Write a protein that binds this ligand. Sequence first.
Ligand SMILES: *[C@@H]1O[C@H](CO)[C@@H](O[C@@H]2O[C@H](CO)[C@@H](O[C@@H]3O[C@H](CO)[C@@H](O)[C@H](O)[C@@H]3O)[C@H](O)[C@H]2NC(C)=O)[C@H](O)[C@H]1NC(C)=O
Ligand SMILES: *[C@@H]1O[C@H](CO)[C@@H](O[C@@H]2O[C@H](CO)[C@@H](O)[C@H](O)[C@H]2NC(C)=O)[C@H](O)[C@H]1NC(C)=O
Ligand code: NAG
Ligand code: IDL
Ligand code: FE
Ligand code: ZN
Ligand code: ZN
Lengths: 335, 6
Amino acid sequence: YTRVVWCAVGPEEQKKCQQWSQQSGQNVTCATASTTDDCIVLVLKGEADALNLDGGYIYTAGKCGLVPVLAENRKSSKHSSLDCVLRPTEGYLAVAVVKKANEGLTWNSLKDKKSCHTAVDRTAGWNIPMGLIVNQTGSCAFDEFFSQSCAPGADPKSRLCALCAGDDQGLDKCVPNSKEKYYGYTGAFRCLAEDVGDVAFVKNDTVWENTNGESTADWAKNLKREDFRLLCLDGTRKPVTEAQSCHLAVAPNHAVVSRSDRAAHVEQVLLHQQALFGKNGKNCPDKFCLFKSETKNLLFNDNTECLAKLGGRPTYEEYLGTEYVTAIANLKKCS
Amino acid sequence: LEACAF
Ligand SMILES: *[C@@H]1O[C@H](CO)[C@@H](O[C@@H]2O[C@H](CO)[C@@H](O[C@@H]3O[C@H](CO)[C@@H](O)[C@H](O)[C@@H]3O)[C@H](O)[C@H]2NC(C)=O)[C@H](O)[C@H]1NC(C)=O
Ligand SMILES: *[C@@H]1O[C@H](CO)[C@@H](O[C@@H]2O[C@H](CO)[C@@H](O)[C@H](O)[C@H]2NC(C)=O)[C@H](O)[C@H]1NC(C)=O
Ligand SMILES: *[C@@H]1O[C@H](CO)[C@@H](O)[C@H](O)[C@H]1NC(C)=O
Ligand SMILES: O=C(O)Cc1cnc2ccccn12
Ligand SMILES: [Fe+3]
Ligand SMILES: [Zn+2]
Ligand SMILES: [Zn+2]
């Protein structure tokens, strides 16, 4: 009797999760919460077993005792002869993106501009950029760096939320789930694409996946990569093809966390589940694809190839890396 | 440092 309860963040993930439950013969069922932290709470109470998390949340969950089970592994180059589930994850590139036409905008002139973040507490969208900015400005008043922003999870009436648009009925403004138009990698990038913001803190892959026809969504179908630039830390601006030499940091892959006593089962289930609905899963695209959601990245990132076994039975600190963990610890000393 | 936020 090993039934796994997943935690969906927001009505859209709940929707996708219920389809997954249905297709899984209920070997996976769904619990739902409004925020990722709520989801972490539910798992602590055991009202839920697991969920996929950005490194920044892995940190919250980890302090609460939850452990990494499997990590997101997207398309790779080296190590590729090895099975995706046995391959070492290579982390992703956190980057700062802006419109090319917004000439003279560099890392060194971000003050009092408009920013777009995936969400408060996330790795590329917040921990890395805010950590860097707090450090470089020698000030903890990061809610006063940019003139306005959309940083889901912040006070809805604060300027950190001024650019957020809420759902299609204008409700839920700045919630840290996908109902907020500018939430996550995609929402933040869109916030920049529509010029609501001057800079978006997302990862390298997001710029590629929503440009040059990679996304047919209405706001993105017509975006061109040439019209965007990455802000390197040395003050220069580079084409989005140079992320390898123009990024804020390399971030650990999003990963699944669960309680310890549920970790083995949750692992067994997911290894089986992705065999069915994973990339070449026996039932995707036929019945259900676990790693697709019309680019909204629900439950898992849309570019995930598989969930990979972790080498060394890593604690959340070993998974995230002492460096990142310290960077977070340091940034959190601010609020 | 340590202590769960919840
Ligand atoms: C923003 O600044 C903070 C404070 O400097 C950065 O944290 C500092 O991070 C370094 C590098 O990870 C830590 O040092 C290392 O020290 C250990 C021994 O303690 C050594 O084994 C390692 O090989 C390395 O030398 C340093 O301890 C740490 N400082 C504090 C107070 O924790 C943080 O990384 C910066 N944030 C960002 C996003 O860069
Ligand atoms: C930044 O992200 C993009 C998008 O994921 C990476 O390019 C992809 O690379 C794979 C092989 O790695 C190609 O087969 C895909 O077709 C590429 N995607 C697109 C949409 O072109 C790109 O390599 C990343 N750059 C760095 C430096 O990591
Ligand atoms: C559900 O779990 C059982 C028990 O291991 C397994 O035999 C069955 O194939 C699973 N079905 C699906 C759809 O996951
Ligand atoms: O210990 C590990 O197995 C992985 C790890 C732990 N801490 C760090 C810091 C930087 C890079 C990798 N790290
Ligand atoms: Fe992330
Ligand atoms: Zn680097
Ligand atoms: Zn270890």
